[PDB]
């Protein structure tokens, strides 16, 4: 939780599984 939005994780922030992290980042 760093002030401003930038903390937010890529791993909690894209899915996990095949149905959407086959997508576009």
Known sequence: ???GFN???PLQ???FQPTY???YQ
Do not use: D
């Open 13 to 15: 922030s894209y899915g």
């Open 7 to 9: 903390c937010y994780f």
């Open 21 to 23: 992290g086959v997508g």
């Open 1 to 3: 939780g760093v002030k």
